Ligand binder design. Structure first.
Ligand SMILES: Nc1ncnc2c1ncn2[C@@H]1O[C@H](COP(=O)(O)OP(=O)(O)O)[C@@H](O)[C@H]1O
Ligand SMILES: Nc1ncnc2c1ncn2[C@@H]1O[C@H](COP(=O)(O)OP(=O)(O)O)[C@@H](O)[C@H]1O
Ligand SMILES: O=c1[nH]c(=O)n([C@H]2C[C@H](O)[C@@H](COP(=O)(O)O)O2)cc1I
Ligand SMILES: O=c1[nH]c(=O)n([C@H]2C[C@H](O)[C@@H](COP(=O)(O)O)O2)cc1I
Lengths: 313, 313
């Protein structure tokens, strides 16, 4: 029986992330490590043309009052659909090879991913929800879609003080991307409410038993994303969310409840960061692979991905 | 051990469907039958305002050359997202109660659903793909999303000659819906290519081993939806689809492969139709329910749904 360690490096944009991955795989470590980059080529080319562009453009156009919110909403939403597709189809072809969580022995393979599905399917959609560019209802469709959480889902988030983080963002700018402090501060809030609802849920937290606290480190319903959904458009005349929306919070729960969050302090020098990441690795969960031939396939798969969609490495 | 029979009545729009459901549940049959309607209230109100409207409007606007395809594409796509959400969140809260397929004994509960997820997540998105209103790439994101097919997924499709079907469509018109023969003929083609790929796959059909036939009742790759994806935008310079798109066909497969299609001849009088539907029921698959208390919950769930979203019954 073998294990394969999957590490899902995430958090908001411009926080040492891609820098510390190529510095972690630079250690000359044998090919037991498979690094998969952002699906950027899907983004810029094969998916749509400069999808990144639209997101950041449609915002200026929105902020500078040149479209109705419902206009920014609809583009902002296909922006998201097209953003996530590539994270999903992968996760689809990787699922049938993932056996149980054999605790934390050495993994015969270690996948280091640049961003995990819920970045494009929950986090950003939620940030735009706060940015007036995404609709509560649309946000929860992505929520209602988030594929079943697989075993061994170790998600590595981040930590850097607003200031030094801002400074970092302003030292590199993406292809067709603008600089947005609100959208920044926004994401930083989703990446907290999220890495907070895990902790909370993991500790027996139930959004339904806690709802009326919202009405008016051990976190409460108030520190969870669940707050963001106490929006007018989702509440019936009785003040209770409609069940359409209600059930979907249950879905959302069951997805986050089973995740393995860790948070690396990006406050250090690139090398040390990766050292830390490397150390976090130890206590992470590893999983058996259903088919004995799975590992190689799980290799090719991600290797093929990074071949076809990594404008990074 | 109990079983619960789930029947997913589908096929294109305006084909006796909603008529024959309310005629099937009209038999006075005890409350062991739970009928769940289309989530229309989500559609018209709580989801977005007159979503149905946009689909059919954005088309005229497209056909009458008043928007770029990429304009119709983006609305047409959120139209779809918002259409399907309600089918999904349900399927999410229904999954954790579905145990294995105990073959075809009597079910302690029978759910009769008006349309199944892949109507809003594969079929229509695919029809618009043919209607110039949906992009190949967007179509395959919904494909890459189609939640894992649960056991006991008996999908009831339909049969009525184009002519008599057209005549039927023109005897009732939806809230903010227009009459489109192409969009009609289109859907009728998706509902065939789909109920065809099942048969084909079920018979050992592999899209990859069959691909080069496309290049240039026992059906071939040419009778499958797989044809629709042999579009320019998905093919690399070598002519092979890119793996992003490639894997997603694999996803699509694994979803359809496990479905239980049946097709009722809608050519009869309403009563008899339902009699037939009733007979099809017999040979359908039933499933055990993981939690012993599942059945009641599976009752309330769908009953609550139809309470909150059934502008039909
Ligand atoms: N430890 C660090 N010290 C100083 N600058 C850093 C450090 N890590 C990343 N940066 C820089 O800050 C920006 C954000 O990092 P990057 O890896 O490029 O992005 P992201 O975190 O969004 O994936 C980049 O310009 C990068 O060079
Ligand atoms: N067996 C039938 N004989 C004659 N007319 C029918 C029959 N079944 C349905 N219709 C009519 O044709 C239209 C399509 O049926 P309906 O149940 O309303 O829609 P749908 O099939 O799209 O769910 C309706 O106007 C309906 O009254
Ligand atoms: O769902 C998403 N939405 C989004 O707007 N981005 C933007 C943020 C940033 O401009 C770029 C991702 O680059 P970095 O993660 O390297 O910062 O795409 C990324 C994802 I995933
Ligand atoms: O994914 C979908 N896309 C779509 O355009 N419709 C339209 C077709 C028709 O106008 C109406 C559904 O009504 P009937 O199924 O009763 O025909 O919504 C429905 C679904 I589900």
């Amino acid at each position: 029986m073998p294990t394969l360690l999957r590490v899902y490096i995430d958090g908001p944009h411009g926080m040492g992330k891609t820098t510390t991955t190529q510095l972690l795989v630079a250690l000359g470590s044998r090919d037991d490590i498979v690094y998969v980059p952002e699906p950027m080529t899907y983004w810029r080319v094969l998916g749509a043309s400069e999808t990144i562009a639209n997101i950041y453009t449609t915002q200026h156009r929105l902020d500078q009052g040149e479209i109705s919110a419902g206009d920014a909403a609809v583009v902002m939403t296909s922006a998201q659909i097209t953003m996530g597709m590539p994270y999903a189809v992968t996760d689809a072809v990787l699922a049938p090879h993932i056996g149980g969580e054999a605790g934390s022995p050495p993994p015969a393979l270690t996948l280091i991913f640049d961003r995990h599905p819920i970045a494009a399917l929950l986090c950003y959609p939620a940030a735009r929800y706060l940015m007036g560019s995404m609709t509560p209802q649309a946000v929860l469709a992505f929520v209602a879609l988030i594929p079943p959480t697989l075993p061994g889902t170790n998600i590595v988030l981040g930590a850097l003080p607003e200031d030094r983080h801002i400074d970092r963002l302003a030292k590199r700018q993406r292809p067709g991307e603008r600089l947005d402090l609100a959208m920044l501060a926004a994401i930083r809030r989703v990446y907290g409410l999220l890495a907070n609802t895990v902790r909370y849920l993991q500790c027996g937290g139930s959004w339904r038993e806690d709802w009326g606290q919202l009405s008016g480190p051990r976190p409460h319903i108030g520190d969870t994303l669940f707050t963001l959904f106490r929006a007018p458009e989702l509440l019936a005349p009785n003040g209770d969310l409609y069940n359409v929306f209600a059930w979907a919070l249950d879905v959302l729960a069951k997805r986050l409840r089973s995740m393995h969050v860790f948070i690396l302090d990006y406050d250090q020098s690139p090398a040390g960061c990766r050292d830390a990441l490397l150390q976090l690795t130890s206590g992470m969960v590893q999983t058996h692979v259903t088919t004995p031939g799975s590992i190689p396939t799980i290799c090719d798969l991600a290797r093929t991905f990074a071949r076809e969609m990594g404008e990074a490495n």
